Structure formats: structure tokens, C-alpha cells
From a paper:
The aspartic side chains participate in the cleavage of the DNA strands along the minor groove, resulting in the hydrolysis of specific phosphodiester bonds upon the coordination of three divalent metal ions.
To broaden our analysis, we also studied the I-[name] heterodimeric variant I-[name]_3115 (Y33G/Q38K/Q44K/R68Y/R70S/D75N/I77Y/I132V-G19S/Y33V/Q38R/S40Q/Q44D/R68A/R70S/D75K/I77R). This mutant was generated using the methodology previously described, and is able to recognize and cleave the human HBB (Haemoglobin beta subunit) gene (I-[name]_3115_target, Fig. 1c upper sequence) whose mutations cause sickle cell anaemia. To understand the molecular mechanism that inhibits cleavage when a G is at −4 position flanked by a pyrimidine at position −5, we solved the crystal structures of the cleavable and the corresponding non-cleavable variant targets in the presence of catalytic (Mg2+) and non-catalytic (Ca2+) cations. As expected from in vitro cleavage experiments, the comparison of the crystal structures of the I-[name] variants in complex with its cleavable and non-cleavable target DNAs in favourable catalytic conditions (2 mM Mg2+), showed the hydrolysed phosphodiesters in the cleavable targets while the non-cleavable targets displayed the intact phosphodiester bonds. We observed that the structures of the variants in complex with the cleavable targets showed the presence of the 3 reported catalytic ions, while the structures in complex with the non-cleavable targets indicated the presence of just 2 catalytic ions, with the central metal position occupied by a water molecule. On the other hand, when the two enzyme variants were simulated bound to the I-[name]_D75N_target and I-[name]_3115_target DNA sequences, the helical parameters of A +1 were similar to those found in the ideal B-DNA conformation, with minor fluctuations typical of atomic thermal motions.
Numbering used by the authors:
A (entry chain A): 2 to 154
B (entry chain B): 2 to 155
The structure:
DNA sequence: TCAGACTTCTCCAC
DNA sequence: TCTGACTCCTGTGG
DNA sequence: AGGAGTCAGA
DNA sequence: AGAAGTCTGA
């Protein structure tokens, strides 16, 4: 539980509300109990020419990783435990994606209890929809109603 | 001069480094002293769906205007005097765009003296090229060399 | 003349 | 099984 | 920016 | 994001 500087969070929040992205998605997984897995993500996009800025962020945050894919580099953070602790400090300074942050945190806290009953799993899948709704959902496929069709078995 | 909150300057600097922009232009102006007008500009582009965010900027900064462009809205600030005061306070928090900001402030200070001899005017025009080079210039047309050709003709 | 108010354009960086 | 590191793709919003 | 995938070690 | 412009009034 590394604590982050307030002035660091303020700048970062402004950068996140601009080029950052708080994603929460459902992926097919035939090896899990409900044939679907959850994926919470903290993304910060920037062009590869300025990938160094993303590298500096891996150190300041501590955990996380930067990937390249063409003329664009991406800082990711999918690891649950540090993600919850990170957003919990970042959230009060967001002005655009603040709603997405509180939703992701709520999912993370209700993550173990959502592996027991299918209805509790569907409820979380609903919370996932409430995040893509706020975002610019363009290429989203697997939703909560997708699970419902498969869950009926 | 207006003083801004550090908390506001910290958040905004990140947003400026993210989706904001810092421009320096040399516009053709036949009714000008040297057939050209200098227009320094600080802008924050954002989706019109989130225009309210740009509307708050006008109140928080105290100046500037917000216009549309289809699905794109822009908060511009070209008024030289409050611009100089704003970028002076925003610069220490800029990371990706601190170099451009200090160059704008550098131009503004030497602006009335630039209207003297063309050689002093052209030096400032070269300082505009520096700002453009730092930015991801794609559709730039008028540079200092455009001015040089015109003034060497008269 | 001039300087601020308003719009149009276009690609790549998200 | 279940998590995280890793790549790839699309379409506007800068 | 917002997703869609894949794959291996644990 | 980063330019290209027009148009008023003082
Ligand atoms: Mg943005
Ligand atoms: Mg940017
Ligand atoms: Mg952007």
C-alpha cells in the first residue's frame, strides 16, 4: 500500500481525464465457473515518441507496465490489489472519469463475493455496463446480457 | 492580476498536457505594419458533449471563450495580457508543454519592441518556428521564412 | 491599423 | 482454474 | 481511447 | 491538437 503524493495525483488526474482511460470489461473464459472473466483496467495512452512519459509513470506509481503497438504506447494497470489502492487515492481528484473510478472500486470490493452465486455475478456484470455507458463504447461486444444467454444452461 | 489556485493549476496542467494545446501563429495581415499579425494562443480541445467542462474554464480562469466546431468544442485564450499572467502560473506544472509555454511568455515580453525594426520583428518570427517545432505541426503554412521573403522584397 | 471575437480545416493520437 | 503480462484493432476526439 | 483478443506460469 | 482563416469596432 504505497501512498502517493497529492500534487502528483492532481496532475495525473488531469492527464487521466484527458488521455487516460478507466476500462472494465468481460472476457470469455471457458475455464472459469461462469464461462466469463472480469477485467479491470487503468489505461494511459500516448504516442510512442513520448513513451518516456509513460515510463516515468511506472516508477512514480511503482506497479504497472508499458506496451507498444505501432505509433502508440500504453501504460496498463490490471493488477487488482494495487489498482484499488491507487484509484482510491486518485478518485477524489477526477472530474470526468470519476464516476467510472468509483464503479471499478465497487466491483473490486465485491469481487470475491461475486464468484459464489450467478445472480451476484450478473449484478457485477451490470455494474460493468455502467462503465462502458459513461465511456465512448464503440467496439464493445461481451456485455451482461451476453452472460445471461450463456447462464441459461 | 488574477491569482489561481495551485490545485486548479495542477489539475489543468495535466489536462493541458493531455488534450490541451499551446499555439504560436504568424497570420497574413495586409493592413498591418509588416503585412503580418502575431497571434499567440492557448487552447483546450474537448468533446461538445462535455462542453460544460470548458464552460467552467471561462469562470475559473476569468477570461477566454468557448466555441463549437461540429462535435468538437474549444476553449481559446488569445488576449495577450491575461494570457501572460496565466501561462506564467501554469508553466511550473507543465511537463510535455513547458517548453512551448515559456517561449510564448518570451514572445509576449518582447512584443512591443518587435514592432520596431524588421530584424527585431523577424527574430521573434523565428521564435514562433521554435514553438511550432515542439508542437506536432502538420498543417503549418506561414513561417518566419515567409516573412523574410516579403520584407526582403520591399 | 490593430487586436480581440468568431469560424473552418485535417490528420494522428488517442 | 485464475491471475497477470502481452498483442491487436477500430473509430472518433483531440 | 476502448475495447477486443491470446498465452503461460502459478 | 494545431493550425488555417474572416470580421468587426475603436
Ligand atoms: Mg480526453
Ligand atoms: Mg496529448
Ligand atoms: Mg487526446
Amino acid at each position: 500500500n504505497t501512498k502517493y503524493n497529492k500534487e502528483f495525483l492532481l496532475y495525473l488526474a488531469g492527464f487521466v481525464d484527458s488521455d487516460g482511460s478507466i476500462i472494465a470489461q468481460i472476457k470469455p473464459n471457458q475455464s472459469v465457473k461462469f464461462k466469463h472473466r472480469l477485467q479491470l483496467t487503468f489505461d494511459v495512452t500516448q504516442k510512442t515518441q513520448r513513451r518516456w512519459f509513460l515510463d516515468k509513470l511506472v516508477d512514480e506509481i511503482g506497479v504497472g507496465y508499458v506496451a507498444d503497438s505501432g505509433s502508440v504506447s500504453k501504460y496498463r494497470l490490471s493488477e487488482i490489489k494495487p489498482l484499488h489502492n491507487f484509484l482510491t487515492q486518485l478518485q477524489p481528484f477526477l472530474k470526468l472519469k470519476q464516476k467510472q473510478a468509483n464503479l471499478v472500486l465497487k466491483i473490486i470490493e465485491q469481487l470475491p463475493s461475486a464468484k459464489e452465486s450467478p445472480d451476484k455475478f450478473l449484478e457485477v456484470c451490470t455494474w460493468v455496463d455502467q462503465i462502458a455507458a459513461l465511456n465512448d463504447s464503440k467496439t464493445r461486444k461481451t456485455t451482461s446480457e451476453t452472460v445471461r444467454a450463456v447462464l441459461d444452461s
